[PDB]
């Protein structure tokens, strides 16, 4: 199962001239395109070696698309100051995420399209892709405007059309790093503590793609709120890392079990110390 996802952000900077508009594109967990309005002569650039041999007609079309969006977000930004009556002195943040989840058989499972203002949800396209969900009475103004204007339809057409078509195309050119599943390197480590007991940390290194669960068990029972867990972090080699740890009594470190589930694991691992 593959996905093509785009993350868009525009942030205002009062006094500090025009706001910053940027776009980052991903396939699965792999970055491949970038946009930044603070670069002089703002144009679209490749962020993965396997995409750069797309042609100029592609990039120019992508420069055209972004710059067009750059305008909508400046205009959208000022509208936010009236829906909410906020100062024209402070800077604000508007977010946007759109993409598609596609099964290996070319069929999609889910498509996203959704906006967030000042770090909080705002409006979002529903799973069924037909009506909008507005967060508040400031966001519901937009709903009516876009329902009458039949906005939802055009949005739906990208997801169903171009997104699927270009993912199938993307997936044939960068298959070296995209069509790959690399297994986790797991183990458990022991660390004595000043407080008199022990910290057991479970490791999972070098796996790809990035979806993974790490878990601790005390003879079959899970200690979720007892473990401390970091977020999945990139190792920078196309692979990822993660760990989770618990605190156990000296002498009972071997009663606790650690499990790792991933695509790169034919059968789910089980580890102890």
């Amino acid at each position: 199962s593959h996905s093509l996802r785009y993350f868009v952000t525009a942030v205002s900077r009062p006094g500090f001239g025009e706001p910053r508009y940027m776009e980052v594109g991903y396939v699965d967990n792999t970055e491949f395109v970038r946009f930044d309005s603070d670069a002089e002569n703002p144009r679209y650039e490749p962020r993965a070696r396997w995409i750069e041999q797309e042609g100029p007609e592609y990039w120019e079309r992508e420069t055209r698309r972004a710059k067009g969006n750059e305008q909508s977000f400046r205009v959208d930004l000022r509208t936010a100051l009236r829906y909410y009556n906020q100062s024209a002195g402070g800077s604000h943040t508007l977010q946007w995420m759109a993409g598609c989840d596609v099964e290996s058989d070319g069929r999609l499972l889910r498509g996203y399209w959704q906006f967030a203002y000042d770090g909080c949800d705002y409006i979002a396209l529903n799973e069924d892709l037909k009506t909008w969900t507005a967060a508040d009475m400031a966001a519901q103004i937009t709903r009516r405007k876009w329902e009458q204007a039949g906005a939802a339809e055009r949005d739906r057409a990208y997801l169903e059309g171009e997104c699927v078509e270009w993912l199938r195309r993307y997936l044939k050119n960068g298959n070296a790093t995209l069509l790959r599943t690399d297994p986790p390197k797991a183990h458990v480590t022991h660390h004595r503590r000043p407080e008199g007991d022990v910290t057991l940390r479970c490791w999972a290194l070098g796996f790809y793609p990035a979806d993974i669960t790490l878990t601790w068990q005390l003879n079959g029972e899970e200690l979720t709120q007892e473990m401390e867990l970091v977020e999945t972090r990139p190792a920078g080699d196309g692979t990822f890392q993660k760990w989770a740890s618990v605190v156990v009594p000296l002498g009972k470190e071997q009663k606790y079990t650690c499990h790792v589930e991933h695509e790169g694991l034919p059968e789910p691992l089980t580890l102890r110390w």
Partner: peptide
């Protein structure tokens, strides 16, 4: 290829 706001503004 990304999506376009198509000037569907709020």
């Amino acid at each position: 290829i990304g999506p376009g706001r198509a000037f569907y503004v709020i």
